[PDB]
């Protein structure tokens, strides 16, 4: 369906390999097994970045299908994805939930942090398990940045990527932001990359 | 297989099992042993007549304090002596 421009370019694979997004966990769960490619000695399993890129483009095709960009919710409790989710919030509509989730944000329609969105994207099904459980009450589809050990409970679209490296978390959010800009008029030509490199999606120190 | 046999040729086992287990029922035990005909003041009848032997003042069970005004009756067809209630306000002066 998608043309040849919708493929893993060498420069896209350059960023994924340089950000260690292909380094999976050492304990693969049975649901994340289709993303295992010749598990490496020293224990680390290697993620199929081609299968990752296909999932990331499909995730974008769901994100760039909600008519109103504001009621797309992107969630990252962990500090590594905190700046990535906020920059994703700035570039797109994407009302962010960075830090604590405040239980009762998808239910409990009277809270200040109440949101009633069409789609939630969480950086971690383990660290954002409250939001996923919350989404299961009000029919919210979920896209989760999943490693090979993170659970796939109520996760419709899992993106197989490393969850430990701050480079990996910032890049996947940056790549997801680029594609949803690409499938719209903000980034009219797909072959041309942005004017700003990915390192503003990375958690900085101190 | 939930206990009981399910064989198509196990009717005897199921019939004897029900026959033996029906003896745990009070009405079946009472009827088949014939306790009403044998160990009962009446002889299995609804009513029985008898001669009054004495008037009794039965102190009611707690938590009720009263006197129930019963009588001692010796049945005619048995000779068994039983206690009977006089069921209305007064009416013990009628019995004699």
């Amino acid at each position: 369906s998608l043309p040849a421009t919708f493929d893993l370019t060498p420069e896209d694979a350059q960023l994924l390999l340089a950000a260690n997004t292909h380094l999976g966990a050492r304990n693969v769960q049975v649901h994340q097994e289709p993303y295992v490619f010749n598990a490496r000695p020293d224990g680390v399993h290697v993620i199929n970045v081609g299968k990752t890129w296909e999932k990331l483009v499909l995730a974008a095709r769901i994100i760039a299908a909600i008519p109103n960009p504001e009621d797309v919710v992107a969630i990252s409790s962990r500090t590594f994805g905190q700046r990535a989710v906020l920059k994703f919030a700035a570039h797109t509509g994407a009302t962010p939930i960075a830090g604590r989730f405040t239980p009762g944000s998808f239910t409990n329609y009277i809270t200040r942090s109440f949101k009633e969105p069409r789609l939630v994207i969480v950086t971690d099904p383990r660290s954002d398990a409250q939001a996923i459980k919350e989404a299961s009450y009000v029919n919210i589809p979920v896209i989760a940045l999943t490693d090979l050990d993170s659970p796939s409970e109520f996760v419709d679209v899992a993106i197989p990527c490393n969850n430990r490296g701050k480079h990996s978390i910032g890049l996947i959010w940056y790549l997801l932001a680029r594609e949803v800009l690409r499938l719209r008029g903000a980034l009219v030509d797909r072959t041309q990359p942005w004017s700003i490199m990915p390192d503003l999606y990375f958690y900085r120190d101190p | 297989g939930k206990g009981k046999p399910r064989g198509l040729n196990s009717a005897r086992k199921l019939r004897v099992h029900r026959r033996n287990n029906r003896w745990a029922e009070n009405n079946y035990k009472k009827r088949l042993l014939g306790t009403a005909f044998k160990s009962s003041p009446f002889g299995g009848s609804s009513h029985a007549k008898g001669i009054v032997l004495e008037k009794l003042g039965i102190e009611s069970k707690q938590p009720n304090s009263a006197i129930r005004k019963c009588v001692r009756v010796q049945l005619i067809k048995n000779g068994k002596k039983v206690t009977a209630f006089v069921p209305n306000d007064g009416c013990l002066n009628f019995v004699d």
Partner: protein
């Protein structure tokens, strides 16, 4: 007056939904009882149980009151609300709200041939709550609702007019009996019959078609 706060409320208030069947079709969660009032104006309700529940405290028992309320028109909708409150009237009023928020559809069918309008249940169905299991069996025309008075009232408010009912467990536990019966009529659309095997083109929810008038700035 009512000011909506949810997307479903703000979109029902604008008149973009005129029937409750769309919400049932797209499984949309209902959070405001005003949505049920707007879409089902003729929703008669009868309180069915008032019992006092006591919580022991150092200075005597603190007594509240639990109200069981069933809402529903006689055309395929029922709701069941359980609510405890200090006051009897407050428990009834808040129980009416929860019963309206629990409004579900029932499937009505024919015991035999499909002559006329549906009069019974499409299939047998069972619901369980606690030890109480309520089984509902399709009945021919003129049989009436063969049920206990509590189960009968829920089914009269369902629109079904011909049913056979079988029950088990401690049926005197009224809240569990009605909840078990409410689950059985909820499961009636859960069953898949051959006349529902034909595939459908999966319609898009109204929350995206009419998404311009949701969550206004």
């Amino acid at each position: 007056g009512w000011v909506p706060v949810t997307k479903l409320g703000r979109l029902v208030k604008a008149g973009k939904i005129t029937t409750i069947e769309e919400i049932f079709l797209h499984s949309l969660p209902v959070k405001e009882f005003q949505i049920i009032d707007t879409l089902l104006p003729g929703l008669q309700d009868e309180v069915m149980n008032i019992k006092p529940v006591q919580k022991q405290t150092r200075a005597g028992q603190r007594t509240r009151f639990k109200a069981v309320v069933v809402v529903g028109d006689s055309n395929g909708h029922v709701g069941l609300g359980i609510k405890t409150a200090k006051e009897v009237a407050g428990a009834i009023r808040a129980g009416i709200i929860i019963a309206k928020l629990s409004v579900i559809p029932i499937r009505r069918g024919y015991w035999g041939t499909n002559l006329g309008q549906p009069h019974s249940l499409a299939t047998k169905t069972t619901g369980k709550c606690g030890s109480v299991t309520v089984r509902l069996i399709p009945a021919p025309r003129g049989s009436g609702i063969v049920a206990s008075p509590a189960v009968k009232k829920l089914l009269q408010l369902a629109g079904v007019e011909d049913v056979y009912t079988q029950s088990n467990g401690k049926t005197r536990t009224l809240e569990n009996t009605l909840k078990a019966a409410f689950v059985a009529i909820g499961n009636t659309y859960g069953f898949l019959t051959p006349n529902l095997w034909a595939e459908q083109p999966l319609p898009v929810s109204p929350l995206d078609i009419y998404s311009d008038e949701a969550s206004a700035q």
